[PDB]
Design a protein around this ligand. Structure first.
Ligand SMILES: Nc1ncnc2c1ncn2[C@@H]1O[C@H](COP(=O)(O)OP(=O)(O)NP(=O)(O)O)[C@@H](O)[C@H]1O
Length: 480
């Protein structure tokens, strides 16, 4: 077939390369053993076709399908001799590693062939000098210490500076989101959804008929209300001012509706951020008034934000939280981009959209009795149980708080390593949520600090270490 395409790529039969290019054949094309044509071309320093391929639009940053002679021989189930003569004659005869070549970009092989020209060609085509192969080796790793290495490392510094400027203006362009991300542990997707919705309304791409309306689905004690207040303080800049919370359970009867119709709280601020808790179990009339608020635009307020919460669909969301995290982090990845493509994949119906219209809305609808009611919401937000790292970070937040307080009041330095956190994480019970952590730290640590300070065993200016001795587990405080 087009084996001759990369035999040409391997021998630099340029007139044939153009030919097949004209027939629309893809440059990314690989061998039966897995190397891209650009790889063979780069390895044998056949620049005319390297140049042409980087012209055609061949991807430089494509990893090799080939691993080792032994390995590929075991995978594709062949004699080691077949595989060997193949890799040797159809690719290169200078490579010595019995290690795996899986994930080597053309830049890798370029450094391995020790030629500056194809390195330069690959770099000019925006190849990654930091792309790691399965081992973790950059092409710089495999570079002889030439000025080739200087070229490649300066490339590294360039790509680095690019990353850094990119960070700087993800900060400049999405400040609310930076604020949420730096004041809230975990819950990536939630922040993304909420912030994006907010500036979606600010820029004017919602029907500015009625203020923002959110529904926070998920579990107790994982950031819902916290996120809400955070948003509030970002908008009104007064921590106190912009925020309203209604405990819905209080309302379950028709007399509660007379009370509900808040009117004064709204009067203090039209523009504030309002939250309802466990909204699923509250009077339908209360919601209809709530929906009337959510449609009307008296009900004076306009530029307000409306948030609702439920433990409803909690179990369902929980049952599978992986594809939600994946999707969330994918969105963050696609956000720091700047071309019409990236936006076009913003067109796509993301798995979350399928997730609302398959499993969630039916349950949401049945509990709610109104098609209209699911219609009224600007956005539905999901909240996830913390992964390990996030729990660690919560504990960390706690210890940092107490260390800080100690250092100002009594000038005491509180210290610890990772094990302490790893142990206190084992004190996280779900039913209370992040506070659970609050408890543990205040129990296993602050009790001890208070006890010691009472007894005058903490002298002003001392230094302490939180340690774990297994003798079953006990946490011990010591003075250094
Ligand atoms: N991601 C989080 N980041 C930081 N603090 C959190 C986080 N999640 C919960 N907390 C802490 O928990 C406290 C409030 O709990 P919170 O998560 O806001 O309640 P909730 O999830 O909305 N459910 P509920 O208990 O009904 O209000 C805050 O003071 C936080 O310090």
């Amino acid at each position: 077939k087009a084996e001759a395409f990369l035999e040409a790529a391997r021998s630099n039969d340029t007139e044939e390369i153009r030919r097949l290019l004209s027939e629309g054949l893809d440059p990314n094309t690989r061998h039966r053993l897995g190397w891209t044509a650009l790889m063979v071309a780069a390895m044998n320093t056949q620049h005319n076709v390297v140049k042409l391929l980087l012209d055609a639009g061949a991807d430089p940053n494509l990893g090799d399908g080939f691993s080792s002679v032994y390995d590929t021989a075991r995978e594709k189930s062949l004699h080691s001799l077949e595989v060997l003569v193949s890799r040797e004659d159809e690719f290169s005869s200078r490579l010595s590693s019995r290690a795996s070549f899986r994930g080597c970009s053309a830049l890798h092989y370029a450094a391995l062939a020790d030629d500056l020209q194809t390195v330069r060609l690959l770099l000019d085509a925006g190849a990654d000098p930091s792309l790691k192969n399965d081992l973790g080796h950059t092409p710089l790793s495999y570079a002889r210490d030439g000025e080739l290495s200087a070229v490649l490392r300066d490339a590294q510094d360039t790509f680095a500076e690019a990353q850094r400027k990119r960070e700087a203006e993800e900060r400049r362009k999405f400040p609310l989101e930076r604020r949420l991300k730096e004041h809230i542990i975990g819950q990536e997707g939630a922040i993304n959804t909420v912030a994006s919705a907010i500036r979606r309304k600010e820029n004017g791409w919602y029907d500015e008929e009625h203020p923002l309306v959110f529904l926070f689905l998920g579990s107790s004690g994982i950031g819902k209300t916290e996120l809400a207040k955070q948003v509030a303080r970002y908008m009104h800049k007064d921590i106190k001012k912009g925020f309203i919370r209604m405990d819905m359970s209080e309302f379950q009867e028709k007399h509660e509706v007379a009370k509900f119709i808040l009117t004064k709280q709204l009067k203090q601020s039209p523009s504030a951020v309002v939250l309802f808790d466990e909204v699923e179990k509250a009077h339908p009339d209360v919601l209809t008034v709530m929906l009337q608020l959510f449609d009307e635009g008296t009900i004076e307020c306009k530029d307000a934000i409306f948030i609702m919460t439920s433990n409803a669909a909690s179990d369902e969301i929980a049952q599978h939280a992986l594809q939600l995290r994946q999707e969330a982090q994918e969105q963050s990845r696609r956000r720091l981009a700047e071309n019409l493509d990236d936006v076009q994949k913003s067109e796509n119906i993301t798995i979350s959209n399928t997730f609302k219209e398959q499993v969630i809305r039916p349950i949401l609808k049945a509990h709610f009795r109104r098609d209209e009611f699911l219609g009224r919401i600007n956005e539905i937000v999901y909240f996830l149980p913390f992964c390990h790292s996030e729990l660690l970070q919560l504990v960390s937040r706690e210890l940092h708080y107490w260390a800080k307080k100690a250092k100002q009041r009594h000038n005491i330095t509180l210290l610890w390593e990772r094990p302490v956190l790893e142990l206190l994480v084992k004190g996280y019970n779900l039913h209370y949520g992040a506070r659970s952590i609050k408890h543990e730290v205040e129990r296993r640590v602050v009790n001890q600090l208070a006890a010691a300070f009472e007894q005058e065993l903490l002298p002003k200016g001392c230094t302490l270490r939180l340690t774990v001795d297994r003798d079953a587990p006990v946490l011990r405080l010591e003075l250094l």
